[PDB]
Symmetry: C3
Subunit: 223 residues, 3 copies
C-alpha cells in the first residue's frame, strides 16, 4: 500500500507540473521565474517519492524505517516554496533577495536538522529537532513580520493575496514537525502507516495546492 | 591502462584551462563570466578524472561515480555557456538558463541512481534522464535558438554551430551508458572507458575552443 | 575535553551571531547582505562543531577524521571570501564574476582537504598540494585584482580592505599548516593540540574577521 500511495503521489505531482507549464504559456503578468519555481517543486518531490515507491529512498535504522528521500525532497522543494512566497510579497515592487536568501538558509538548515535528528537517538535527536523548530519559528516571524510589511508596501490588493498564501503555507509548515515528533522518527505515538498517509496528503496541498492558490491570485491582478 | 588514460585526460584538461585563461587576458568583447565558465568545466572534470586515475573515484560491476561528480557540475556549466552564447549582445533570460541547469542536474542524478539500480528500476531512472535530455534539446533548437536569431545573423550562425556540436556529443553519453556495463553490457568496460575519455575532451575543451573563438570573432 | 571544547565553541558562535544581528538593526550604511553573511558563517560553524561535541561529526579511519570540519568550511569559507570581496566593492560596482571565481577556488580547496584526509601516502599530498595551489591563486586575487577594486573605491575603504585582507590571509595559511603538522598529515602534533588549534583559529575567522570587517565599514558611515 505504501508503494502504491507513492506511485499515485508522483503521478499527481506530474499533473500539477503540467498544469503550471500550461499556465506559463499564457502568463498574465506573472514572470517566467515564478512558473519555473512552481514546476520544479512538484517534479523534484515527484522524483523523490518515486524512489520510495520503487523501494530505494528508504532504509532500516534503529529498527525503524528512515524515508531519507523525504529530506532529499524537502531540502530543494521547501526553500523553493519560501522563495515563491517571498516573490509574492515583492510582486510589483523592488526585490529583497537578502530576505529571500535568509529564508532559504533558515529552511535548508531546518531540513538538515530533521535528517540528523532522524539518524540520532535519545536527547541528541531532540537537540537537532529543537534547532529545526527554532529555525521554523524565525521563518514564521519573518513571514508575518518584515516579509508581510514588504507585501503591504506593494498595495492593499497584493498584501491581501500574500496574507492568504502566507496563512495557507504556514498552517501546512507546523503540521510537518508535529507529525515528525508524534511518528516513528520521534515519540512513536502515531503508527508508521498513519505517518506515511500524512506525508502523502500534506505535500499534495504544499507542492501543488500552494502554487495553484499563489499563481491564480497573482494572475487575477492582471488587466 | 585505465589509470594512464585518466592521468593523460587530466593533463589535457589543465592545458585547456590554461589556454582559456590566456584568452581571458585579451577578452575581445567576451565577458569575464564566459571565460570563468570555460575554465571551471575542464578544471573540475580534470580533478574528478584524476581521482579515477588514483583509483579513488570508483567502487567495484565497476561504478565510476567520479564521472557523475564531474558531470553534475561540468554539464550544467556547458549548458550555461551555450545559453549565454545565444544571449550574446542581447538581454539575458536567466529563467531559461536555470531551466536548462535544473533539467541537466536532474538528468545526471537519474544516471547515478540508474547505475546504483538493477532491472526495470535502472531503466525507469535512465528513461527519466532521457526525457530531461529531449526537453533540453527542444529548448536548445526551439526557444533558445529563437533568442540567438534575435541577436543577428552572425551570432545565430555561431550559436547553431556550437548547438549542433554539443547536441551531437550529448546523445553519445546515454547511448554509450546503455550499451556499456551500466546498462545492457553489450560494449566491453575498456571500450566504454575510452569513449568516456575521448568524448569529454571534445565537450570539456573542444566546445569552449569553438565557442570562445566564434564569440571573439564578433569583436571584428 | 574535546567534546566540552566543541560545546564552548558553539556557544561563542551563537554569541557572535547575536552580536552581528544586533549590529544589523542599526546598520550604519552597511547593506543587509553583509550582516546576513556575517551571521550565517558562525551559526553554520556552530552547528557543525555541535555535531562533533555530540560525537556525530567524526569517525575512525585507527585515526579520527573530523569530517564535520569540512561540512563547516565548504559553506563558511566561501562566505568569508564573499564578505572580503563585497568589502573591496563597498561604495562601487560589484564584480560577481571575481566573487564567484573566489567561491569556486575556495570550495575546490576544502574538497581537496576532505579527499586528502580520506587518502594515504603520496595520494594524500597530491590532493593537499592541489588545495595549496587553489589557496595561492586566492591570495594572488586578494592582493592583486580584488585589492585594485578596493583602491578604486577610495583611500579609507582601501585602507580597511587591506587590513581585513591581511587578517584573513594570516588565518588562511594557519589552517593548511596545522592540517599538515597534525594527525591528518605528518602527525608531528598530538590530536589534542590540533583540536585546540581548530577551536581557537575559527573563533578569530568566524567571529573575529566579521567584528573587524563590519566595524571598519560602519566607521565609513556619514551621520
Ligand atoms: C543544497 C540545497 C540548496 C537548495 C537551494 C535551491 C533553492 C533556492 C532557490 C532560490 C530562488 C531565488 C530566485 C530569485 C528569482 C528572482 C526573479 O524572479 O527575478
Ligand atoms: C531525484 C531524487 C531521487 C533520489 C533517490 C535516491 C534513491 C537511491 C536508491 C539507491 C538504491 C538502493 C538499493 O536498492 O539498495
Ligand atoms: C545554511 C547555508 C545556506 C546559505 C545560503 C545563503 C547564504 C547567504 C548569502 C548571501 C545572500 C545573498 C544576498 C543577495 C543580495 C542582493 C541584493 C538584495 O536584493 O538584497
Ligand atoms: C511564531 C508566530 C509568528 C509571530 C509573528 C511576529 C511578527 C513579527 C513582526 O511583526 O515583526
Ligand atoms: C487529524 C489527525 C490524523 C491522525 C490521527 C490518527 C492517529 C493514528 C495513530 O495513532 O497512528
Ligand atoms: C490540488 C490540491 C489542493 C487544492 C488547493 C486549492 C484548489 C484550487 C483553488 C484555486 C483558487 O483558489 O484560485
Ligand atoms: C574535486 C573532485 C573530486 C571528486 C572525487 C573524489 C573521490 C575521493 C574518494 C576517496 C575514497 C578512497 O580513498 O577510497
Ligand atoms: C549544481 C551546481 C550547478 C553549477 C552550474 C551553475 C551555474 C550557472 C551560471 C550562470 C551564470 C549566468 C550569468 C552570466 C552573466 O550575467 O554574465
Ligand atoms: C534549481 C533551480 C530552480 C529554479 C530557480 C529559480 C531561478 C530563476 C532565476 C530568475 C532570474 C530572473 C531574471 C531573468 O529571467 O533574466
Ligand atoms: C533527439 C530528438 C529530440 C528533439 C530535437 C529538437 C526538437 C525540435 C526543437 C524545437 C523546434 C521549435 O521549437 O521550433
Ligand atoms: C575506433 C575504432 C573502433 C575499435 C573497436 C570498437 C568496439 C566497440 C564495441 C565494444
Ligand atoms: C549542520 C551539520 C551537521 C553535522 C552532521 C551530523 C552527523 C550525522 C549523524 C551521524 C550519527 O548520528 O552517527
Ligand atoms: C561554481 C561555478 C562558477 C561559475 C559561475 C559563473 C559566474 C557567474 C557570475 C555572474 C556575473 C554577473 C555580472 C558581474 O557582476 O560580473
Ligand atoms: C563546486 C565548484 C567547483 C569549482 C571548480 C574548481 C576549480 C575552479 C577554479 C576556477 C577559478 C579560476 C579563476 C582564475 C582567474 C580569475 C581572474 O581572471 O582574475
Ligand atoms: C606549488 C606548491 C604546491 C605544493 C605545496 C605543498 C607541498 C607539501 C607536501 C609535502 C609533504 C610530504 C611529506 C611526506 O610525503 O611524508
Ligand atoms: C607562495 C605564496 C604566494 C602568495 C602571495 C602572492 C601575493 C601576490 C601579490 C599581488 C599579485 C597579483 C597582481 O598584482 O595581479
Ligand atoms: C527537478 C526537475 C527540473 C525540471 C525543470 C522544469 C523545466 C521545464 C521547462 C521550462 C519551460 C521553459 C520553456 C520556454 C519556451
Ligand atoms: C546527549 C547529551 C548532550 C548533552 C549536552 C546538550 C547541550 C545542548 C546545547 C544546544
Ligand atoms: C537557526 C538558529 C538561529 C539562532 C539565532 C540567530 C540570531 C537571531 C535571529 C533573529 C531573527 C529575527 C527575524 C526578524 C524579526 C523582525
Ligand atoms: C499582524 C500580526 C502577525 C502575527 C501572526 C500570527 C502568527 C501566525 C501563526 C501561524 C501558524 C498557522
Ligand atoms: C586559432 C586557433 C587556436 C587553437 C589553440 C588550441 C589550444 C589547445 C589547448 C590545449 C587543449 C588540449
Ligand atoms: C531488459 C532490457 C531493457 C532495456 C530498456 C532500454 C530502454 C530505455 C529507454 C530508451 C529511450 C529511447
Ligand atoms: C545531434 C542531435 C540534433 C537534434 C536536433 C535536430 C532537430 C532540430 C530542429 C530545428 C528546427 C529548425
Ligand atoms: C559504452 C561504449 C559504447 C560504444 C560507443 C557508443 C556510441 C557513442 C558514440 C561513439
Ligand atoms: C566516438 C567516440 C570515440 C570512440 C572510441 C572507441 C574506442 C574503442 C576501442 C576498443 C578496444 C578494445 C576494448
Ligand atoms: C532579518 C534577519 C534574518 C536572520 C536570519 C539568519 C540566517 C541564519 C541561517 C541559518 C544558518 C545555520
Ligand atoms: C552524514 C551527515 C550529513 C549531514 C549533511 C550536511 C549538509 C551537506 C554538506 C554541506 C552542503
Ligand atoms: C559546495 C557548497 C557551496 C556553498 C556556497 C555557499 C554560498 C557562498 C557564496 C555566496 C555568494 C554571495 C553573493 C552576495 C552578492 C551581494 C549582492
Ligand atoms: C546577476 C546574475 C547573477 C547570477 C548568479 C550566479 C549563479 C550562482 C552559481 C552557483
Ligand atoms: C585550482 C587549480 C587551478 C589551476 C590553474 C588554472 C588556470 C590558471 C589560473 C590563473 C589565475 C590567476 C589569477 C590572478 C591574475 C593576476
Ligand atoms: C597539548 C596541548 C597544546 C595546545 C596548544 C594550543 C595552541 C593554540 C594556539 C593557536 C594558534
Ligand atoms: C576574537 C577576535 C576579535 C578581534 C576584534 C578586534 C576588535 C575590533 C577592532 C575594530
Amino acid at each position: 500500500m505504501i508503494s502504491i500511495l507513492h506511485y499515485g503521489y508522483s503521478f499527481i505531482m506530474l499533473l500539477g507540473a503540467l498544469y503550471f507549464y500550461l499556465l506559463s504559456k499564457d502568463p498574465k503578468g506573472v514572470p517566467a521565474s515564478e512558473y519555473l519555481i512552481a514546476m520544479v517543486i512538484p517534479l523534484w518531490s515527484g522524483a523523490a517519492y518515486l524512489s520510495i515507491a520503487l523501494g530505494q529512498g528508504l532504509f532500516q535504522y534503529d529498527d525503524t524505517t528512515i524515508y531519507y528521500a523525504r529530506y532529499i525532497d524537502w531540502v530543494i522543494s521547501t526553500p523553493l516554496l519560501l522563495a515563491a512566497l517571498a516573490l509574492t510579497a515583492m510582486f510589483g515592487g523592488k526585490k529583497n533577495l537578502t530576505l529571500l536568501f535568509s529564508l532559504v538558509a533558515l529552511d535548508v538548515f531546518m531540513i538538515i536538522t530533521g535528517f540528523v535528528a532522524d539518524l540520532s537517538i535519545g536527547t541528541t535527536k531532540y537537540i537537532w529537532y529543537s534547532l529545526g523548530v527554532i529555525a521554523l519559528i524565525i521563518i514564521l516571524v519573518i513571514t508575518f513580520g518584515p516579509l508581510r510589511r514588504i507585501a503591504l508596501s506593494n498595495g492593499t490588493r497584493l498584501a491581501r493575496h500574500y496574507t492568504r498564501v502566507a496563512i495557507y503555507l504556514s498552517a501546512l509548515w507546523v503540521c510537518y514537525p508535529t507529525a515528525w515528533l508524534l511518528g516513528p522518527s520521534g515519540l512513536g505515538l502515531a503508527q508508521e502507516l498513519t505517518e506515511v498517509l500524512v506525508f502523502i496528503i500534506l505535500p499534495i496541498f504544499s507542492k501543488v495546492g500552494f502554487s495553484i492558490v499563489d499563481l491564480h491570485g497573482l494572475r487575477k491582478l492582471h488587466q
